[PDB]
Amino acid sequence: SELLVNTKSGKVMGTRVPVLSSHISAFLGIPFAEPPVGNMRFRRPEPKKPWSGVWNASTYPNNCQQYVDEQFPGFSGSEMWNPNREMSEDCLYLNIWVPSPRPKSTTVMVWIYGGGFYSGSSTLDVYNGKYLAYTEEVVLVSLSYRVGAFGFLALHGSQEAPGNVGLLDQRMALQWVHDNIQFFGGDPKTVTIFGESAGGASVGMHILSPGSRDLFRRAILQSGSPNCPWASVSVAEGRRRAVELGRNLNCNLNSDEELIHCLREKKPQELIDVEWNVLPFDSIFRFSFVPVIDGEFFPTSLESMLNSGNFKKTQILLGVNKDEGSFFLLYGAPGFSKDSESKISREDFMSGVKLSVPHANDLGLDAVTLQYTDWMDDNNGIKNRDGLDDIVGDHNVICPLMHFVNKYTKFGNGTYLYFFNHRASNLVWPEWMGVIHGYEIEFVFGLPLVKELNYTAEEEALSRRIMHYWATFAKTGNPNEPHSQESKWPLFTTKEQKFIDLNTEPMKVHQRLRVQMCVFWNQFLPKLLNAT
Amino acid sequence: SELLVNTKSGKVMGTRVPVLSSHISAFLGIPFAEPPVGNMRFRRPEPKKPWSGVWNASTYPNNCQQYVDEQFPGFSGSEMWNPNREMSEDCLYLNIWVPSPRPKSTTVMVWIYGGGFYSGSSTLDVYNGKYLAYTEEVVLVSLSYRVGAFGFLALHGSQEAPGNVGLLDQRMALQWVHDNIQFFGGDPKTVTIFGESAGGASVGMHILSPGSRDLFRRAILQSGSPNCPWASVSVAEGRRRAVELGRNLNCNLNSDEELIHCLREKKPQELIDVEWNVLPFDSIFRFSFVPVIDGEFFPTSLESMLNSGNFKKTQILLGVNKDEGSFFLLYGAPGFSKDSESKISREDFMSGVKLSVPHANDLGLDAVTLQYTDWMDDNNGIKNRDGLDDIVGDHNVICPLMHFVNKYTKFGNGTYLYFFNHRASNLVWPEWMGVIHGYEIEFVFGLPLVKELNYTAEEEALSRRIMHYWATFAKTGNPNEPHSQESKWPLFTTKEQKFIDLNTEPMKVHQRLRVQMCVFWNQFLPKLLNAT
């Protein structure tokens, strides 16, 4: 049977799913690791023991335990990111969409979801891989990994809670794909890992980590890079937050063994209830439990690795959205609301700056403020609003990615950069939020092709073009169709630094993306904070 | 006789001079102080002992001893600023142009020449007061004062070389005008002091100094303000440069009396030959002997005086030119030449920045560099050239004046601000230099009215308009003609901060002159240098 596949871990039975008037095979909920439950909580994942019989892979698996957004109950804009399956620590599974008839050895794409390392699910409707798998004829895989304290509590030195285990979950899934995707018609030597936000950061981390490099061919990073200020902490900061977490649950803190033991007896929701109380500063765009520079997964600092070319050298395709920072301002900055234009006063602008660069002294705050203020019109609510939006997106997403791309390109084998600036016509979020963090995803997964979701014809065309770019890149290392009559997405070079816009208008090539602001964030500000 | 005037110091005989097909009286070379020669060198000026008989005031006096620009021998552009009379320490004289028939009690305007406090003459063709005196019917006075070490060598504590004596020369001339201008038909209660560059700074200094306030009614400052970074030094820096000057002339340095004595035996040219060797840094737009915050002429720091409103409160009219910094770059920055477009390389730009902000550390230099660099086109020679030009003008002239005007306006009784951006059609300097430091002067003195100088009709009209603004302001404290049909030059207020452009085009009102850059120079940079 086309729905029956014999893997090295055992037999699996998929289900035939309908897609754009056709069908394909879907193997949902395939286990790739032993449930990280009980004394296994916080531990490195263990490969799933092979099973006898046939594993029923007809339905989605549980989503990992995570904080649930209730800011706008029932609002689709936010609900679409929340777990749509029951939560459970028994959540290490992967899903596979396979073209029908089953391919023999085709391009494979593995999706890593974002969610600030504290949330995320591989089962979201917006991550449905059937459209992409079907349209581009690729074997699409979406993995899962532990988030929150469960995936990133770090107590360096102990083997019970070493940290980075969520990244190891990802790696194990990639190991499984490398070992078994061939049986699903996938070519293990042509696997592209791709993800957005924390998932984009993750992809970058697998590019850096020696232990992950050999498990994939190329990579795509969307609105995220390994060097993002929110993507990692030092072993010292990690330990401090772990201890503070224990302190929030009245844990004995005399030893790691003591702390770990206590944390393991707590119910999932007990950890989630206090998870945000460990942040060192009053901030936005900062998450409690994230990857840690432990000297193992990452041998040295990320910057020294990037400088010395200590990373996998292959081709990469990455980019950012126009208004990466709007969502976090909405959720955590005074003066921003979902149902108003959110014109910001000068006072709220200053408050916003303080929240956005939590690690800065007064001189630093003054530098940022000066950089983003039009002094000929400083009390303009729109300009103040948009200014804060840029500060957040530039500092947390765009500039970190630009630093990564420039460092990578020096040693890499091909870079393709994009700037997504199309505001979807059916967008439910307010206009002031613009082109939102994460809203390029629906185009990458081809949702616009579904009439019921009512996008415009132009948007359907954009999605098809984006899907073909992603899949062609995954297949060849070049998003451009060889001998095509279409406009060519140019390579990004250390010299020209070219990139393209991704929207419903005729492709346009630009250079030095957000260079003026990124020189400030990547060169000047750090030097300033270092000296002062 | 109309050319004979009996003053409290003695009788003076002027000469009838032709002007625009008419005539007026000119009393040139009137002494207002005893020659500051011999043991009087470096000393405070002494009032001129009254004389018996008639003083011949038919010809210009000698110019004070000063450095002479020989960079472009014969070039009118630079020669027009050099002494056009014989130099001598016996140079404390003033000139007076009087309408004919002699007025009874008319508006008086006293000109204070610039020249970085190290040079300058009241006899330059560009300072000929006959056009202004004739056209606007005012008694025009141009004074003189010691410059260089002669006027500003400062050894605080000693009464032989106290410092600021050049400013005291100016004050004595103003005292003379207050005491005798009535005999020339001038109204001593309606005297406006005006000057450009160091002369503009001087005007501001008389506004601040308690000992000068009562000697004039209102003021006009052109391309200069008291708080300019080059306009003054601390008593400590003043003493250091005095000692270093002595060290350059192999003087005994065991005591002030010793140093002073030695310096007094040197010929004028001996001091001038080493005058520039005492500057602490490799810089541009910095002069060796300038006013000193001694605690006498200026009771406290200039900034505290400005903050507390410790200054004369009256009306003021002031402004700057579009390209204040070009001249100094030409003379002291690598890559600039009179006969080329002076497109600057990135290296020369950096060299220029270092020379322009001599008192800054690396972080400071980086801040300036970042502020004036277009990172989307950093190797553009024109942009680099123009960028440096703005750095020099903004830092040394415009921003200091904007800080002064804003501080003054809080306590003042009326402020009128202008931005001169007309490039004269007969300008001999290269195009890249733009609207040059000091080139608004010829319009203020009405040279365009002289056909032989071949300006355009538009420029003649501009000059007449500027002359009428200056004289009307001097007469009433408002440059605007009451009940006029002409566009109104609006008051500058702390709230609106309005100003006008001064050129051959229809008057246009703007607000917050160079505010973006001045917030950098007046608020951010200082804070940065203070912290780091």
Ligand SMILES: c1ccc2c(NCCCCCCCCSc3c4c(nc5ccccc35)CCCC4)c3c(nc2c1)CCCC3
């Ligand atoms: C990728 C992945 C997720 C996306 C998405 N996720 C919702 C993001 C909400 C970010 C703002 C932080 C919200 C949680 S703050 C917080 C708190 C607490 N506990 C927490 C515990 C865990 C995480 C956050 C917690 C308790 C004290 C009160 C605050 C959203 C968007 N894009 C995404 C793209 C676009 C806007 C809608 C939300």
Ligand SMILES: c1ccc2c(NCCCCCCCCSc3c4c(nc5ccccc35)CCCC4)c3c(nc2c1)CCCC3
């Ligand atoms: C008001 C007053 C004067 C103006 C005017 N004066 C010429 C300004 C030249 C400025 C650059 C500094 C030139 C002297 S540097 C110098 C040196 C030395 N000694 C000096 C001694 C005194 C003063 C400067 C000295 C010896 C070592 C070599 C250098 C010029 C301009 N505007 C002016 C407006 C516009 C450009 C033409 C020159």
Ligand SMILES: *[C@@H]1O[C@H](CO)[C@@H](O[C@@H]2O[C@H](CO)[C@@H](O)[C@H](O)[C@H]2NC(C)=O)[C@H](O)[C@H]1NC(C)=O
């Ligand atoms: C300059 O000062 C004069 C008075 O010293 C100001 O005029 C006075 O204004 C107040 C309030 O506006 C009136 O109550 C007085 O009757 C006015 N006195 C006279 C003699 O007019 C004038 O407003 C000030 N100008 C500026 C720009 O500050």
Ligand SMILES: *[C@@H]1O[C@H](CO)[C@@H](O)[C@H](O)[C@H]1NC(C)=O
């Ligand atoms: C598991 O497979 C069975 C058929 O073997 C079928 O009921 C369904 O696809 C799965 N179970 C659930 C959740 O209904």
Ligand SMILES: *[C@@H]1O[C@H](CO)[C@@H](O)[C@H](O)[C@H]1NC(C)=O
């Ligand atoms: C001084 O006045 C005399 C006439 O008294 C006349 O020669 C001339 O105006 C002046 N002297 C000079 C320099 O010729």
Ligand SMILES: *[C@H]1O[C@H](CO)[C@@H](O)[C@H](O)[C@H]1NC(C)=O
């Ligand atoms: C688009 O269809 C109708 C309007 O034509 C609208 O009511 C519906 O909510 C939209 N579909 C979705 C996916 O919300």
Ligand SMILES: *[C@H]1O[C@H](CO)[C@@H](O)[C@H](O)[C@H]1NC(C)=O
């Ligand atoms: C203007 O007149 C002629 C050209 O018409 C020119 O040669 C002369 O130099 C100019 N006059 C001046 C003041 O230089």
